[PDB]
Amino acid sequence: SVIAKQMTYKVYMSGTVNGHYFEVEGDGKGKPYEGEQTVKLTVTKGGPLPFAWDILSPQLSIPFTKYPEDIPDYFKQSFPEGYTWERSMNFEDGAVCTVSNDSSIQGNCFIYNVKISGENFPPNGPVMQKKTQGWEPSTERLFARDGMLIGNDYMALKLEGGGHYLCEFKSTYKAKKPVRMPGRHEIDRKLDVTSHNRDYTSVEQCEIAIARHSL
């Protein structure tokens, strides 16, 4: 059984955001059939981050997504060779990020190598000012195309004082071997920073993630 009921993973992250260089390693764990995972992160390099932890949160694992038996789990199918992806984040104030990832595996452990580039975060905006307060639960609209999966999600980052700081997610997931596509579907997600030290050089997060059909 290529994907067990309970698994771990390791995540390796680096990138640059408004000029600042950093790296982040995390140990993670969940039950891929439940859609549940937590992960613990250290900022190995460039800590303390001068920007909000949150723009990193979601580049820190799709296989822990609960799919119903009647939709083709593209993510799990792709193993053990696994898969890769690219994503961009376009924020309401012209700040952008781009992200790519390689996801493979090693027995009961996934290995994720992710890279992040980001800029045009206004210096007294909420990303550089650290005034965000997490992501709102969301829903990703996925559809098949040339054996890739396409992804769209309109995300909102909560602000200090009750605002919201909007952001488009466009993502392309690509299997390393070809696999049985599903058709249009959506992933309901919640994702939270459950704990962190004071300058956010250790940080832990939890995610729940569930698939179902579109309308």
Calpha distance 215→197 (Å, rounded): 42
HSE-up of residue 185 (Cα within 13 Å, Cβ side): 21
DSSP string computed for 55-70:
GTGGG--TTS-B--TT
Extended beta strands in 62-163, E state: 83-91, 96-106, 109-119, 132-135, 138-145, 148-159
Give yes or no for a contact between 149 and 173, defined as CB atoms under 8 angstroms apart.
yes
Neighbour tally for 35: CB within 10 Å:
21
Structure method: X-ray
* Sequence-ordered list of residues with C-beta below 8 angstroms from that of 211, at least 6 positions apart, any chain: 35, 65, 66, 67, 68, 71, 73, 185, 186, 187, 188
* Position 117, amino acid: S
Sign of CA dihedral 56, 96, 52, 134: negative
Identify the helix (H) or strand (E) that includes residue 76: helix 74-77
Neighbour tally for 173: CB within 10 Å:
20
Could you identify the residue written with the tokens 């569930």? 210
Give yes or no for a contact between 151 and 138, defined as CB atoms under 8 angstroms apart.
no
Neighbour tally for 81: CB within 10 Å:
11
Give yes or no for a contact between 153 and 138, defined as CB atoms under 8 angstroms apart.
yes
The matching CATH number, chosen from 3.40.50.1370, 3.30.230.10, 2.40.155.10, 3.30.465.10, for 1-215 is: 2.40.155.10
* Position 180, amino acid: R
| Domain residue ranges in the chain | 1-215
**Which two three-digit tokens encode residue 52?**
């909000």
Resolution as reported, in Å:
2.7
DSSP type of residue 123:
T
* Position 110, amino acid: F
